[PDB]
Design a protein around this nucleic acid. Structure first.
Ligand SMILES: [Cl-]
Ligand SMILES: [Cl-]
Ligand SMILES: [Mn+2]
Ligand SMILES: [Mn+2]
Ligand SMILES: [Mn+2]
Ligand SMILES: [Mn+2]
Ligand SMILES: [Mn+2]
Ligand SMILES: [Mn+2]
Ligand SMILES: [Mn+2]
Ligand SMILES: [Mn+2]
Lengths: 97, 92, 78, 105, 104, 92, 96, 79
DNA sequence: TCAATATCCACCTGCAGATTCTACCAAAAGTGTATTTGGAAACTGCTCCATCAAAAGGCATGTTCAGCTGAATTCAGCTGAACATGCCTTTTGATGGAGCAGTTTCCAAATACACTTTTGGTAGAATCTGCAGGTGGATATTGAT
DNA sequence: ATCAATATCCACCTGCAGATTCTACCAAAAGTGTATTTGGAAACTGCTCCATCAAAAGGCATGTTCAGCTGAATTCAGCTGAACATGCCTTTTGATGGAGCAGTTTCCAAATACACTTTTGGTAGAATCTGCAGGTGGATATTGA
């Protein structure tokens, strides 16, 4: 009987998804989120499917290179785990909030 | 000859703080501001018209550009004043 | 629906970022950042939408919304 | 003979705004309310920076606004700060700000 | 006959000249400007396809997909600087794990 | 009724890699890219002329813009390619 | 004999220079540098005095919010001293 | 060789305006090099604008345009 | 320090979905002629830049000395990873209808031109006048104990 | 939480360099009237886009266990801050000569506007191929011991 040492599988998943290109959030919840947010700015709005597509590509990209930066802050504090104060600094030093 | 926003800026100063003045270096900073905000607003209204295959920049483009380029509350006030001025101006 | 952005989906995103270990507090944090981002992009896109007197948000509206935030996107027009 | 600016109730020059728009390569034709609307907005934002700078100039017990005051006025205003976030005011300095950690016990 | 033929180019000198004239860039457009700009667009386009085609064949495919474009841009010191603020849809990221996170 | 850079890109593809093809999603990206760089070079050359009280965008504005907008080695080559093309065009 | 505890004077200098607006690098050394850098790019070149003026306001303005960012990275690693790996991280997340 | 003209104590003042309380000895050579790179990019663009205008003198406006190009808009030299 | 499970990497295959490759018709692109016009050439009053002399005080440099910082070591609780069952929410595919874009047509109102007057905004002069330095009394700061 | 020795703050002073006025032209708005566009109201036609519905099915939520990582904690060699004294160089300033600006004309070369005449590039079909994705054969990765 044999089982992955913590950290091993995560490294195998890093290699797995840096290698791949598909959208990583489930499409329907995401779509639901877009429409909700939109309905607050204005009701009765409609979306080309490619508009939600475009919103998702952009969103997953922005979240991915934020984790790249968050990770760098986590390393800088001689840790291996990302933590909320890591994403807060990362965001802080890119002017974005 | 070198035109500038100096006199117009000065008048607005006397409107908000009548007994207050302004150094020339500070005046150039304000001058810079107006050119900067102008080019921001104009250019974005340029791009708006261009996307809508329209060849005219109208005040409706200026307003929408202000709604994009200005942070929430700043824009609300600006938009009221922008509106208030063309409707006053059409009646004259 | 923000809760529909699930824990393991966020984990995959982070793995694409080379993140190896993740605090449990990252997920509600991440949700909050995604929400702010969408709120700013969609608001600018809709503002482009209503300007054209339309009721339908096109891909180009979003593409323009992203260029405004300094996030040029390729593959839906420009 | 009335100024285009007076009909609008404005202090900024609508005719100049209109000229800079036309000679500025922004679009082929320029609407009649466009420079009126723009000048009003330019004038509003100028009012807003000058009011808050004037306040900072009196807090400094000066009666003439200098660039330091404009800097203190922008950076201390949440929204003006966002608007001019990529902008350097020469001879303006920075806001007084020490990170709590660096303070004594 | 085509202006594009007279210039030694594959991009359309004529379209460029129109897009410049109708683009609200200036009242007048010089005659060599659209040739020059078309040539630059061709050059940059040539260089990306050169590197994308290569990146597809290193992967033993013979059709360029967005991944190949992404890998080509991000692996190029200078192209990457040029398109540093650009997201390529369906491109993924470069394979890159921080050394500190490896075992040993 | 709806123009694009797709055919010209394909032609250029066939020069560098005659046996290689390109998916449609990849072509929309190449397209996006071509429009992007155009507006960049066009916009900067627009600004150049306006800063100089000039009303013609010439090949010299284009070249100066490329020198601003492109990274070093990349710019060197494009300036070479752009010149090489305009000088050829004069001899015809 | 009476003397400042390390850091006390340091805190007093931060307060002092956040209060002022004067250029903090010496003008003539700076000028000498600009022209040196400029001459490698192109020879026989001249500068308006404000051209060098603008170059310096800009330069300092940039270095100052770079130290601000460098300082934040330093706090983030629970130190108080800024160090090269602080300026390196800061620059990396600023596009640079 | 003028880069040594940015002195250690001058850099400190800048750090003090940046809110720095304590400073490593490796920061100064590090700070100088960063400064030299910044100027090299600004000056080159500024010079490109200068030579385009067929001038032999770098104006203040060249620098302001060069800076606006790097996303660093600057106020007080417009007029 | 080596061996057994598993896993991924290698190479191979026949086709549906995508990509190529073809076959007409507007709408751009190209031409021909007739004008404009922007901006290069050649010259020129004048800034504005470059040096220079050099005294003179302000800042930098280098050494000493002390306290406190960051780097290094150890260690326990507890967080977050790995895994499996099970159920649900998503995905997927076809369908239907209604609300929109998008296509053209066609005039009113809006904008651009082209000239003729009417001022306002600018550029130097000619005036005022806040603020820079300098100084004397208070109040804060800081280490010492 | 009391103290003496310092540093800093706040206001006043006066002479001036820079800010505000004040004048006297001149481009540039404003004014009128004529010549064009344009964007928009209508009417019309498809296209998408919203909304169902109903399967499998793949992926999320939950629950269990434990490795190892993060946070708490102790000590120290030397790193850096603070102070001093010594000395170098930056700053200041007033004057000059000329280089290199702008400013003014002058005038073709180059670019725009129309009006006709080809050619191309875009679209909808007609005719093609590359991977995908199984199957399962030599290596790679992993952890147990
Ligand atoms: Cl530590
Ligand atoms: Cl004390
Ligand atoms: Mn999800
Ligand atoms: Mn030309
Ligand atoms: Mn219908
Ligand atoms: Mn004083
Ligand atoms: Mn006395
Ligand atoms: Mn005293
Ligand atoms: Mn004085
Ligand atoms: Mn179980």
């Amino acid at each position: 009987p044999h089982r992955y040492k913590p950290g091993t599988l995560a490294l195998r998943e890093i290699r797995k998804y840096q290698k791949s290109t598909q959208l990583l959030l489930r499409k329907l919840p995401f779509q639901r989120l877009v429409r909700e947010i939109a309905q607050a700015i204005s009701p009765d709005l409609r979306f080309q499917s490619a508009a939600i597509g475009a919103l998702q590509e952009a969103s997953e990209a922005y979240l991915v290179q934020l984790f790249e930066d968050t990770n760098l802050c986590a390393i800088h504090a001689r840790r291996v785990t990302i933590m909320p104060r890591d994403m807060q600094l990362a965001r802080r030093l890119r002017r974005e909030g | 000859r070198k035109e500038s926003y100096s006199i117009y800026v000065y008048k607005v100063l006397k409107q908000v703080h009548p007994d207050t003045g302004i150094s020339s270096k500070a005046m150039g900073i304000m001058n810079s501001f107006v050119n900067d905000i102008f080019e921001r607003i104009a250019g974005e209204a340029s791009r708006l018209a261009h996307y809508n295959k329209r060849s005219t920049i109208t005040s409706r483009e200026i307003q929408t550009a202000v709604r994009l380029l200005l942070p929430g509350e700043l824009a609300k006030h600006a938009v009221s004043e922008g509106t208030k001025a063309v409707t006053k101006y059409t009646s004259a | 629906n923000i809760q529909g952005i699930t824990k393991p989906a966020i984990r995959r995103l982070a793995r694409r970022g080379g993140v190896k270990r993740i605090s449990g507090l990252i997920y509600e944090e991440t949700r909050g950042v995604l929400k702010v981002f969408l709120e700013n992009v969609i608001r600018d896109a809709v503002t482009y939408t209503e300007h054209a007197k339309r009721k339908t948000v096109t891909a180009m509206d979003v593409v323009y919304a992203l260029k405004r935030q300094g996030r040029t996107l390729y593959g839906f027009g420009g | 003979a009335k100024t285009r600016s007076s009909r609008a109730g404005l202090q900024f020059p609508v005719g100049r705004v209109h000229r800079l728009l036309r000679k500025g390569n922004y679009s082929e034709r320029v609407g009649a309310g466009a420079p009126v609307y723009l000048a009003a907005v330019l004038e509003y934002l100028t009012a807003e920076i000058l009011e808050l700078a004037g306040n900072a100039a009196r807090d400094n017990k000066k009666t003439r606004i200098i660039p330091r005051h404009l800097q203190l006025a922008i950076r201390n205003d949440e929204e003006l700060n966002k608007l001019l976030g990529r902008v350097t005011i020469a001879q303006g300095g920075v806001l007084p700000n020490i990170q709590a950690v660096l303070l004594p016990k």
